[PDB]
Design a protein around this ligand. Structure first.
Ligand code: HEM
Ligand SMILES: CCCCCCCCCCCC
Length: 400
């Protein structure tokens, strides 16, 4: 079987073959049912306009029946079910989004701007020139995970624990990478235990920004307790680390493919902010999110039935030629670059978007300060998944 339009296949992303099928799907079937399968049947929502209309309709297309193409996958007593306010609806969703959003008030960005800058500086000065190395590990991960260590508190030493994402379950819960039942789950419990210790370490003092803090001593009018954790902090971890990483990893890789557009940026640091957006578009650190139809419905032609599983391929959206012409080129001056769907749309749009915008900016700032230019050597070891989207290894050196 090569459904071709079964764009679930982790092959396409690892090997970088997703461009053509999603080029056709847009031009002849932007809403298309993949009957079978790999994950079970889905609806490939593959274009810009249609996505928006799904995400602006939280009743017709729920977030509280799973949010990636993976499912609950079990009957009755094997418990599981890890809550997450990204996987919520109705009012409760707005309840809990309230209780983390103040971490990303632009004044908090200004407060954290100065620390972020020291660590971005400090990292880039450890780097040596023309000697090869791994952009992913030495920069994109190393920074990124620092940031998540400050958003919780670890503190510092052994913060590499936060690199237990292993949540590429867009391709891990599908006949088991690890048998699973006491593996990704046990990896997740050993996390939760550790964070429970951190929750009990903070039941004195005021709000110490986010780091549990914000879930309690900073009011938290609801957001009680009761293993929301494996869930909410699963969410927070992945959001606050992996997404940014693959972007930093993409600034090195991406720009280098389009070295003229890089040189213009190199010349003009006022381009930076639009550069950040343009890059976040390009990459789409999460290629897709899924909704689930609660009642029967019409959508761009197609006939969605209560039960059906939707699948919003931002990855293809951000290359919709209706909106961004020559989308498969990085163009750092591209005006509308800010209108990408990588952070998403509607009431779920990434609450951390301003922080990721900062982390990247400062990288490209601290880089300009230094006259860097990252030169990619081999091709990168990509991730194999429909959900996460970037790089496990990037081989580079730096010049001037
Ligand atoms: C380049 C960086 C990032 C990208 C591409 C990204 C992407 C996304 C996307 C696509 C969603 C779902 C959007 C939707 O349904 O409309 C989302 C939700 C979320 N992201 Fe991010 N994200 C990023 C950074 C962050 C950071 C830094 C944090 C936290 C510190 C974070 C926390 C979240 C949270 C909490 C949600 C769920 C919000 C809700 O309930 O609607 N993200 N993110
Ligand atoms: C079981 C696989 C789905 C869970 C993946 C973690 C939650 C995704 C949050 C996205 C970060 C913004």
């Amino acid at each position: 079987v090569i459904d071709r339009f079964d764009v679930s296949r982790p092959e396409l992303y690892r090997d970088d073959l997703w461009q053509a099928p999603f080029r056709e799907l847009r031009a002849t079937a932007p809403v298309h049912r993949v009957e079978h399968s790999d994950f079970g049947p889905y609806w490939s929502v593959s274009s810009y306009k249609p996505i928006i209309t799904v995400e602006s309709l939280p009743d017709l297309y729920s977030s509280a029946g799973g949010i990636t193409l993976a499912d609950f996958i079990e009957n009755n007593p094997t418990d599981v079910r890890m809550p997450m306010f990204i996987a919520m609806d109705r009012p409760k969703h707005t309840g809990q989004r309230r209780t983390v959003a103040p971490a990303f008030t632009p004044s908090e960005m200004v407060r954290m701007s100065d620390n972020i800058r020291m660590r971005t500086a400090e990292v880039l000065d450890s780097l040596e020139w023309n000697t090869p190395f791994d952009w992913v590990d030495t920069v994109s991960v190393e920074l990124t995970t620092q940031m998540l260590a400050i958003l919780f508190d670890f503190p510092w030493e052994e913060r590499r624990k936060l690199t237990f994402w292993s949540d590429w379950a867009g391709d891990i819960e599908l006949v088991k990478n690890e048998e699973l039942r006491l593996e990704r789950l046990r990896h997740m419990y050993e996390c939760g235990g550790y964070f429970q210790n951190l929750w009990n370490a903070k039941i004195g003092k005021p709000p110490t920004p986010d780091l549990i803090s914000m879930m309690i001593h900073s009011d938290a009018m609801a957001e009680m307790d009761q293993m929301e954790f494996l869930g909410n902090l699963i969410l927070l971890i992945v959001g606050g680390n992996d997404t940014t990483r693959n972007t930093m990893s993409a600034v090195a890789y991406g720009l280098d493919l389009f070295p003229d557009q890089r040189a213009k940026l190199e010349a003009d640091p006022s381009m930076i902010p639009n550069t950040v957006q343009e890059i976040i578009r390009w990459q789409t650190p999460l290629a897709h999110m899924r909704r689930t139809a609660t009642v029967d419905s019409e959508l761009e032609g197609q006939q969605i039935k209560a039960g059906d599983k939707l699948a919003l391929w931002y990855i293809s959206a951000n290359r919709d030629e209706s909106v961004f012409e020559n989308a498969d080129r990085i163009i750092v001056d591209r005006p509308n670059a800010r209108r990408h769907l990588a952070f998403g749309h509607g009431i779920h749009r990434c609450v951390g978007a301003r922080l990721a915008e900062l982390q990247i900016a400062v990288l490209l700032e601290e880089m300009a300060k230094r006259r860097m230019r990252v030169n990619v050597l081999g091709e990168p070891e990509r991730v194999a998944a429909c959900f996460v989207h970037g790089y496990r290894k990037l081989p580079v050196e730096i010049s001037r």
